[PDB]
Design an enzyme around this catalytic site. Sequence first.
Site, PDB file in Angstrom:
ATOM      1  N   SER A   3       0.848  -1.205   0.000  1.00 55.42           N
ATOM      2  CA  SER A   3       0.000   0.000   0.000  1.00 55.42           C
ATOM      3  C   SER A   3       0.896   1.273   0.000  1.00 55.42           C
ATOM      4  O   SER A   3       1.613   1.489  -0.979  1.00 55.42           O
ATOM      5  CB  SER A   3      -1.006  -0.044   1.167  1.00 55.42           C
ATOM      6  OG  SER A   3      -2.097   0.842   0.949  1.00 55.42           O
ATOM      7  N   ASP A  39       0.131  -4.454  -3.725  1.00 60.98           N
ATOM      8  CA  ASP A  39      -0.996  -3.538  -3.844  1.00 60.98           C
ATOM      9  C   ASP A  39      -0.570  -2.102  -3.571  1.00 60.98           C
ATOM     10  O   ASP A  39      -1.138  -1.457  -2.688  1.00 60.98           O
ATOM     11  CB  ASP A  39      -2.170  -3.959  -2.896  1.00 60.98           C
ATOM     12  CG  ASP A  39      -3.494  -4.055  -3.602  1.00 60.98           C
ATOM     13  OD1 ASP A  39      -3.499  -4.077  -4.862  1.00 60.98           O
ATOM     14  OD2 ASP A  39      -4.507  -4.259  -2.920  1.00 60.98           O
ATOM     15  N   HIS A  87      -7.514  -5.510  -0.616  1.00 59.64           N
ATOM     16  CA  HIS A  87      -6.331  -4.828  -0.100  1.00 59.64           C
ATOM     17  C   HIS A  87      -5.798  -5.442   1.171  1.00 59.64           C
ATOM     18  O   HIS A  87      -4.582  -5.518   1.353  1.00 59.64           O
ATOM     19  CB  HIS A  87      -6.698  -3.363   0.184  1.00 59.64           C
ATOM     20  CG  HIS A  87      -5.545  -2.408   0.164  1.00 59.64           C
ATOM     21  ND1 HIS A  87      -4.639  -2.380  -0.894  1.00 59.64           N
ATOM     22  CD2 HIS A  87      -5.221  -1.429   1.050  1.00 59.64           C
ATOM     23  CE1 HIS A  87      -3.784  -1.400  -0.618  1.00 59.64           C
ATOM     24  NE2 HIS A  87      -4.095  -0.800   0.546  1.00 59.64           N
TER      25      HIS A  87
HETATM   26  C1  LIG Z   1      -9.048  -7.434  13.184  1.00 56.03           C
HETATM   27  C2  LIG Z   1      -8.347  -6.471  14.106  1.00 56.03           C
HETATM   28  C3  LIG Z   1      -7.564  -6.967  15.144  1.00 56.03           C
HETATM   29  C4  LIG Z   1      -6.913  -6.108  16.005  1.00 56.03           C
HETATM   30  C5  LIG Z   1      -7.024  -4.747  15.842  1.00 56.03           C
HETATM   31  C6  LIG Z   1      -7.788  -4.232  14.814  1.00 56.03           C
HETATM   32  C7  LIG Z   1      -8.466  -5.080  13.944  1.00 56.03           C
HETATM   33  C8  LIG Z   1      -9.256  -4.450  12.844  1.00 56.03           C
HETATM   34  C9  LIG Z   1      -8.528  -3.933  11.778  1.00 56.03           C
HETATM   35  C10 LIG Z   1      -9.154  -3.310  10.709  1.00 56.03           C
HETATM   36  N1  LIG Z   1      -8.366  -2.817   9.650  1.00 56.03           N
HETATM   37  C11 LIG Z   1      -7.205  -2.108   9.706  1.00 56.03           C
HETATM   38  N2  LIG Z   1      -6.455  -1.920   8.652  1.00 56.03           N
HETATM   39  C12 LIG Z   1      -5.322  -1.177   8.937  1.00 56.03           C
HETATM   40  C13 LIG Z   1      -4.341  -0.886   7.850  1.00 56.03           C
HETATM   41  C14 LIG Z   1      -3.566  -2.140   7.485  1.00 56.03           C
HETATM   42  C15 LIG Z   1      -2.677  -1.996   6.277  1.00 56.03           C
HETATM   43  O1  LIG Z   1      -3.432  -1.680   5.120  1.00 56.03           O
HETATM   44  C16 LIG Z   1      -5.256  -0.831  10.243  1.00 56.03           C
HETATM   45  S1  LIG Z   1      -6.592  -1.398  11.160  1.00 56.03           S
HETATM   46  C17 LIG Z   1     -10.542  -3.220  10.702  1.00 56.03           C
HETATM   47  C18 LIG Z   1     -11.285  -3.731  11.753  1.00 56.03           C
HETATM   48  C19 LIG Z   1     -10.661  -4.347  12.836  1.00 56.03           C
HETATM   49  C20 LIG Z   1     -11.507  -4.886  13.963  1.00 56.03           C
HETATM   50 CL   LIG Z   2     -10.036  -3.630  -1.432  1.00 62.81          CL
END
Ligand SMILES: Cc1ccccc1-c1cc(Nc2nc(CCCO)cs2)ccc1C
Ligand SMILES: [Cl-]
Length: 371
Positions: free
Chosen positions: A219, A242, A297
Amino acid sequence: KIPRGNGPYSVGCTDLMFDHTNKGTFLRLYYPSQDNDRLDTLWIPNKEYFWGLSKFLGTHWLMGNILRLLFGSMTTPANWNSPLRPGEKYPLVVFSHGLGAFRTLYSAIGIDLASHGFIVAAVEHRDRSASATYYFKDQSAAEIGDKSWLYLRTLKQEEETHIRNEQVRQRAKECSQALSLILDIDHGKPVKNALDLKFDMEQLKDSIDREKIAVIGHSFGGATVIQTLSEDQRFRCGIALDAWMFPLGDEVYSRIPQPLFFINSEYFQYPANIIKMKKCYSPDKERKMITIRGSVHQNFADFTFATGKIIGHMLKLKGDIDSNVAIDLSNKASLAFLQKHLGLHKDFDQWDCLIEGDDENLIPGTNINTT
Ligand SMILES: Cc1ccccc1-c1cc(Nc2nc(CCCO)cs2)ccc1C
Ligand SMILES: [Cl-]
């Protein structure tokens, strides 16, 4: 569960911070390990990362505490502080995280590379693109472990072009600086880790195949791949997972002599982005592009393994494709590309056909039509 690596080597993990300041290097190291009976590695090791993640997701910092309750004890399958496997020089990957991420969130990738005999330096960026990061204000602070936290910066629309570019340029410098730190540790320089960890950096002396260096990233990290290649010829090739191309300045596109591999998801990419990737193409240059069918992504980062299939799909953490299936394709295609452009003497050429997108779950090039 984050998957164990597919390669023959056991995997160790440690953290390195040198110097202790906000201008120093902070990285998570994945490496071939001597031993396989250590404790697994804590995935998100501090409450403030959860606070940062909550801020990046647009929720209240107390949703951070609920994420910490759910995920705060989660491990990733690497032997924490394990001794390095002796008696071999290892190629080096410097790895660059996405926006809202930080050094620990691409362990499925780092563990897999390390299981095939790579050392992986997953940098934590101090450009305010990380959800959270930390450092020490001075030597006294480092000693007592009084951390200063730095949180993600949200931009006004007018700041986007200029600040994303300052950030990608800081990120490239941080990749180069991380390379130089590892090479100096290989070349025997005494380095006092700002973190008091039971891993002696003296083990890394004479351990790096000093010319077999690559840069990989997802990214924002995928743009960091490209900026890093254009500024630091020590990196011999790069793999952009990506890539988000927006941060790059107009100047960089014609300035990338090294082989470059774009591995994309099906659902993230869009014409403006693809047009920028095609601007890196030139007849004298080695370029490859593949798209993973049914992928999103998030398939390149660890959150794709952190929940079940239904919640995963709802949160856009998972695509139509199985997450292990997708990462194996991206990791195996990456190994074959690295064998080719680093001149490795391994068996990674068994996945050469994946570089060409020749698999039921690969698209050669892109699904995106441009002009
Ligand atoms: C599944 C999870 C575990 C522990 C902490 C947060 C989550 C979580 C994470 C996202 N997605 C995210 N993506 C990024 C960018 C990554 C690189 O692109 C940062 S948080 C959405 C929802 C949840 C619950
Ligand atoms: Cl996507």
